[PDB]
Ligand SMILES: CO[C@@H]1O[C@@H](C)[C@@H](O)[C@@H](O)[C@@H]1O
Ligand SMILES: CO[C@@H]1O[C@@H](C)[C@@H](O)[C@@H](O)[C@@H]1O
Ligand SMILES: CO[C@@H]1O[C@@H](C)[C@@H](O)[C@@H](O)[C@@H]1O
Ligand SMILES: CO[C@@H]1O[C@@H](C)[C@@H](O)[C@@H](O)[C@@H]1O
């Protein structure tokens with residue numbers, strides 16, 4: 110069983126975030142121009158996808174974590190990770 | 200056993216599209232700033248990836264749906280989903 | 290089981306698109322730059338693939354994350370061939 114990843118990036122430095130789903134847990138590795146480091150994101154999930162956008166210089170990230178038929182959205186809007194309004198009927 | 204997702208976003212509202220492959224079928228959930236809703240995208244596939252770009256304010260989306268070794272590209276260019284020219288090998 | 294897994298990225302307004310496919314332990318690349326699909330130079334081992342890219346004016350930079358077991362290897366395109374990146378899962 111191999112891990113499954115998702116990646117996003119922004120700006121010109123750039124900043125990169127790589128999410129890895131491994132044995133039901135999703136963790137995050139970060140690059141902001143110095144070295145790679147472990148990010149704050151840690152949520153359950155067997156599958157992960159991500160998207161992000163800038164509002165000026167501020168990054169907004171949405172991570173979609175799935176276990177079984179349930180996908181939970183996690184939001185970064187500059188202060189911390191919060192559960193989003195995303196729902197689906199899988 | 201878990202569903203597999205792909206996500207893309209555009210602009211600063213933003214608009215978000217999340218594709219979910221579940222039991223051989225891909226469906227789409229949409230956000231344009233005022234609640235999640237079910238999109239028009241419905242195509243076969245066990246795996247999904249997506250990318251998108253803007254030309255001015257017009258969004259263009261490409262969804263890559265795979266079953267076995269066959270990947271089919273689906274195109275949104277502002278006027279419905281159409282099958283794209285993408286081919287792989289074999 | 291038996292289905293390939295893909296990752297895609299795009300840039301500009303032509304556009305250019307790159308689609309990476311992990312099939313039976315090998316990752317390959319298909320390219321579009323407005324004039325037909327062609328096979329790219331990317332060829333690395335892996336069971337899973339993800340990608341991200343960013344433009345610096347007209348210059349594309351791509352990072353492909355190829356995984357086998359718990360090891361993810363980053364591959365870099367900065368205009369001059371694919372090179373192994375500094376990404377690691379732990380310090
Ligand atoms: C500043 O915090 C770091 O960057 C944010 C954009 C998030 O990726 C977070 O999980 C990470 O720890
Ligand atoms: C403001 O709402 C938050 O951000 C939107 C862009 C969506 O991700 C939504 O599900 C989330 O709750
Ligand atoms: C207006 O239509 C909605 O947005 C488009 C960009 C597509 O995602 C389509 O499937 C969806 O129903
Ligand atoms: C113009 O051609 C259409 O759009 C391009 C950006 C590609 O996705 C191609 O496969 C598709 O048929």
Ligand SMILES: CO[C@@H]1O[C@@H](C)[C@@H](O)[C@@H](O)[C@@H]1O
Nearest residue numbers: 307320328329330331349366
């Ligand atoms: C010009 O070379 C083509 O485009 C580059 C941006 C890379 O995707 C490379 O693997 C591909 O063969």
Ligand SMILES: CO[C@@H]1O[C@@H](C)[C@@H](O)[C@@H](O)[C@@H]1O
Nearest residue numbers: 123140352363365374375376
């Ligand atoms: C300059 O460093 C290269 O590019 C950065 C944006 C990262 O992808 C890093 O792992 C890689 O080695």
